Write a protein that binds this ligand. Structure first.
Ligand SMILES: Nc1ncnc2c1ncn2[C@@H]1O[C@H](COP(=O)(O)OP(=O)(O)NP(=O)(O)O)[C@@H](O)[C@H]1O
Ligand SMILES: [Mg+2]
Length: 251
């Protein structure tokens, strides 16, 4: 059974892409066959895994449009994950998708052609709530929200949760919000903890554990950040294998 995880948050700079790549690497180390999907036209994930987006002959853009088969667009990574990459062409997608029926289901249709080739698909959503993020949420079974806890600024969480609810009502009833993954956690004071407690208090959003400390990127070594990503990846594995609920930062 292929697990599809979307990593989404319309707020920019909260470590979505670092989280996709680092969870992907951790799961690959544990033996899972991993596909990463870059849905950001700026191509941060693609660049971070060693592919110049501007030089890709095709990308996920042609795949979403149905003009190129998904397998033909896949590229390799040094750590063994497979990548469905993106480049700036993808910014034109919604102009072309809006003119077509079922624009929300383009990525879902593409992944259906790859089912059984991968144990886990992780989708890197751009900092927006438009057609590309909707495609990510519509194709996924689970979603996590990387949530920065350097500052108290979280006015966008409400609209993000509304977006999840809308997707569950219209395009993907089975989507499960696993919760928020704390990122950019600062160990110098209790401020980051207090930020996370504030979010857990005010929003119907599980805050998951462990936080990823502040040290796009790919944390795969013996650092505290890599250690935390591997611990979180283990939690995902247990949840998918035994139904174990994801551990929470605060109950
Ligand atoms: N644990 C970390 N410690 C320090 N810097 C980090 C960490 N995680 C991410 N960063 C940096 O924070 C910045 C934003 O990370 P990134 O993974 O690109 O977030 P993002 O949510 O994908 N940005 P965007 O797609 O534009 O919304 C990058 O410069 C990363 O290298
Ligand atoms: Mg990103």
């Amino acid at each position: 059974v292929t697990r599809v995880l979307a990593v989404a948050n319309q707020k920019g700079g909260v470590a979505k892409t670092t989280t996709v790549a680092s969870i992907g690497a951790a799961l690959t180390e544990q033996g899972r066959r991993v596909l990463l999907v870059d849905l950001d036209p700026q191509g941060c994930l693609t660049f971070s895994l060693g592919h110049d987006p501007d030089k890709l002959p095709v990308s996920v853009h042609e795949v979403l449009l149905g003009d190129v088969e998904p397998s033909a667009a896949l590229v390799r990574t040094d750590e063994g994950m497979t990548l469905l990459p993106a480049n700036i062409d993808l910014a034109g997608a919604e102009a072309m998708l809006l003119m077509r029926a079922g624009r929300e289901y383009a990525l879902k249709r593409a992944l259906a052609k790859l089912d059984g080739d991968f144990d886990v698909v992780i989708i890197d959503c751009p900092p927006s709530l438009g057609v590309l993020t909707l495609n990510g949420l519509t194709a996924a079974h689970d979603v996590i929200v990387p949530l920065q806890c350097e500052t108290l600024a979280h006015r966008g969480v409400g609209q993000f949760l509304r977006t999840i609810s809308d997707v569950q009502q219209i395009t993907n009833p089975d989507l499960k919000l696993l919760g928020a993954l704390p990122t950019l956690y600062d160990s110098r004071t209790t401020h980051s903890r207090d930020v996370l407690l504030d979010v857990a208090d005010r929003y119907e959003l599980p805050v998951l554990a462990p936080p990823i400390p502040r040290t796009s990127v790919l944390a795969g070594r013996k650092s505290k950040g890599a250690i935390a990503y591997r611990e979180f990846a283990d939690a995902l594995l247990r949840h998918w294998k035994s139904g174990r609920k994801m551990p929470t930062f605060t109950p």
